[PDB]
Amino acid sequence: QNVGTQAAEEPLNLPISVCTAPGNCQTEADAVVLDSNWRWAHTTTGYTNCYTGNLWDTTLCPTPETCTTNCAIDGVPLADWSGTYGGSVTGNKFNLKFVTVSTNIGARTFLLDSTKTRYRMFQLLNREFTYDVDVSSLDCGLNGALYFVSMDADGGAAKYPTNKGGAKYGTGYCDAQCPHDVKWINGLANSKDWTPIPGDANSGKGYYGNCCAELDIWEANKQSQAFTTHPCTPNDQTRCEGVVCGDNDSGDRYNGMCDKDGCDFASYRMNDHTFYGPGSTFKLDSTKPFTVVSQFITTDGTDNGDFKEFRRFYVQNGVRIENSKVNFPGITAYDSITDEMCAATKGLFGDLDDHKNKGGMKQMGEAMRKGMALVMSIWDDHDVNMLWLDSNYPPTGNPSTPGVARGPCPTTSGVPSEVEVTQANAVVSFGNIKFGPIGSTV
Numbered sequence: 001q002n003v004g005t006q007a008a009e010e011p012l013n014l015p016i017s018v019c020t021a022p023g024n025c026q027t028e029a030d031a032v033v034l035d036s037n038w039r040w041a042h043t044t045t046g047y048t049n050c051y052t053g054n055l056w057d058t059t060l061c062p063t064p065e066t067c068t069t070n071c072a073i074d075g076v077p078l079a080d081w082s083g084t085y086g087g088s089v090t091g092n093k094f095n096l097k098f099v100t101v102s103t104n105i106g107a108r109t110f111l112l113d114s115t116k117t118r119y120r121m122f123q124l125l126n127r128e129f130t131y132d133v134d135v136s137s138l139d140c141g142l143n144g145a146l147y148f149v150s151m152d153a154d155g156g157a158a159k160y161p162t163n164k165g166g167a168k169y170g171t172g173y174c175d176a177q178c179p180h181d182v183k184w185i186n187g188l189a190n191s192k193d194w195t196p197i198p199g200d201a202n203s204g205k206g207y208y209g210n211c212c213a214e215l216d217i218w219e220a221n222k223q224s225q226a227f228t229t230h231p232c233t234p235n236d237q238t239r240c241e242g243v244v245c246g247d248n249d250s251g252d253r254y255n256g257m258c259d260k261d262g263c264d265f266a267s268y269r270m271n272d273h274t275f276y277g278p279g280s281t282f283k284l285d286s287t288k289p290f291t292v293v294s295q296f297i298t299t300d301g302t303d304n305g306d307f308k309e310f311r312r313f314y315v316q317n318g319v320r321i322e323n324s325k326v327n328f329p330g331i332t333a334y335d336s337i338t339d340e341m342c343a344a345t346k347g348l349f350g351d352l353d354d355h356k357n358k359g360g361m362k363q364m365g366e367a368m369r370k371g372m373a374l375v376m377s378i379w380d381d382h383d384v385n386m387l388w389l390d391s392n393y394p395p396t397g398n399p400s401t402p403g404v405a406r407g408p409c410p411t412t413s414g415v416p417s418e419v420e421v422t423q424a425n426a427v428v429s430f431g432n433i434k435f436g437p438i439g440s441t442v
Contacts, residue, residue: 001036001171001184002044002072003164009033009075011112011168012089016120019436030120032094032376034085035108035170036155037183039073051183054196054204067189068162073169086427093132093431096378098142099424105202110151110170111374118153119167121371122435124296126303129217130441134289134429136278138221140407141386141414143379144428145219148372149175150212150235160187174237176230176258178209178245185210186239199417200382209245211238211258213367217294222278222286224390224407226266227294227312229337231355231363232258235370248383254354263342263355265312265334266389269406270345271327277408284314284321289429291315295438296368307365310337315442328402337361349403378428385414 012032017025041051043060050060050071061067081087085104086097096107113120122129135144155172157163163184165171173182181203183190190206197203213235216228232238238257246256253260267275276284284290293313298305312335314321325333326341331348334341339360346353359366380386387393390407391414397404413419434441 001041001068001163001165001169001187001189003169004040004042004044004072004074006040006042006047007075007077007080009168010078011116012081012087012094014089014094014111015092016433016435019434019440021440022442024440025434025436029114031112031116032087032089032109033112033167033170034076034087035110035173036073036165037173037181038085038104038107039076039169041071041073041183043070044072053201056189056191056194061189061191064188064191067191068187071189073165073184075169092433093429094376095427095429096144096376098378098426099420105420106377106379108173108375108377108379110167111376112167117166117168119151119155119373121153122148122374123303123371124148124215124368125307125365126296126298126301126305126438128293128295128436128438128441130291130293130434131430132289132291132432133218135220135222136287137426138428139423139426140221140223140390140409141380141419142221142423142426143219143381143386143389144221145375145377145379146217146430147219147375148215148217149173149375150214150237150367150370151373152237153371153373156187156237163187172237174210174212176211176214176232176262177260178211178240178247178256178258180205180207180209180245182206182210197382203382207241209240209247211240211245211256212236213258213364213372214262215364215368215372216262218292219389221390223409224266224268225276226264226269226389227310227337228262228264229310229355229361229364230259230262231358231360231367233358233363235363235367254352259354259358261351261354263337263346265310265323265337265341266406267324269403270324271402272324273408275324283324284316288316291442293441297438298365306362307368308338308361312336351403376430378426380416380419381414382416385416387411387414390414
């Protein structure tokens with residue numbers, strides 16, 4: 001995309017901590033940038049929309065190349081962050097409102113480095129990543145997500161010279177779902193064969209998808225939470241078409257370059273329904289804030305080893321809370337993501353181990369070694385109504401069959417039109433982000 005001249009781009013300042021030992025950290029003066037999908041797209045030498053509602057203008061965008069020549073994405077000024085997009089920062093806390101009323105629904109954002117010209121790339125192997133979260137106002141159907149993806153640090157600017165904005169304009173998004181709803185891919189409008197998504201007034205799908213590796217630290221609302229590894233072959237940003245995208249709609253979910261299911265550790269799905277929930281007698285009380293700690297263990301305990309284990313623990317009101325465990329007869333009580341856990345649990349659930357097909361923890365680790373961009377988002381799910389996270393999936397499945405039940409939400413929950421009314425004022429908060437060696441962040 002070209003860059004427009006109507007509004008300066010002003011990312012929100014967000015300090016994080018880089019740590020060397022427990023309680024010995026230094027501030028890193030980073031910032032938050034809005035994903036290019038949420039930006040106004042208009043004519044390069046005017047005010048005329050190139051995209052309105054869920055459609056590209058066919059006169060301006062008869063082809064992707066012409067669209068890209070004629071159109072530009074514009075900046076987010078400071079005033080518009082809260083007023084238009086529902087984003088705000090207080091000290092080291094970042095807040096994202098779900099619906100902001102001209103009416104904005106959801107948000108996806110990235111962490112910029114201290115220069116505000118590149119994404120802050122995190123080399124996560126043999127490191128610990130930690131943050132405080134509040135998901136108390138997110139119920140069934142919503143997801144306040146924090147995760148990493150194998151985006152380029154410059155959003156693709158060096159690879160795709162028609163991308164003028166780079167990381168500064170939140171470009172280059174890709175993930176392990178190979179999404180077609182990304183409006184700008186490889187420096188070009190994804191306007192070919194663009195199709196609105198029914199019941200989604202703001203979104204559509206273009207000819208291409210954009211694939212890359214994804215490490216989900218946090219997919220969650222107050223009812224259920226998960227962390228998940230998604231390797232791809234290769235891991236780096238890859239525009240896809242046809243079978244390579246692994247499109248759900250053509251029966252290709254397991255035929256593409258990315259592991260779409262991922263290998264998940266989701267406490268409720270692993271059959272501990274009392275670990276996490278909205279109340280003081282759950283082990284971890286989702287009505288109150290808490291700290292989420294993630295440790296990325298290698299084979300030799302060094303930065304050069306292969307990724308072998310994703311460990312997790314929590315801190316809430318000064319109380320250390322170890323992760324829940326897998327709880328099925330004849331299955332080891334795993335409390336972390338490893339290749340063995342993935343094989344054993346997917347075996348039990350009858351899920352295809354595409355994680356293993358894509359190179360497993362080792363391949364996931366190669367993405368983490370090269371460095372990944374931090375994503376913070378809030379969203380509802382127009383495909384599957386978040387049932388995969390917090391309900392029975394498939395909805396018609398027996399909840400006593402291992403793998404089906406992922407949370408207590410009813411299978412009628414999560415319809416975007418309903419959650420966008422009922423949960424309009426939901427806000428996820430991510431704060432006090434800390435990064436360092438294992439054992440350094442609490």
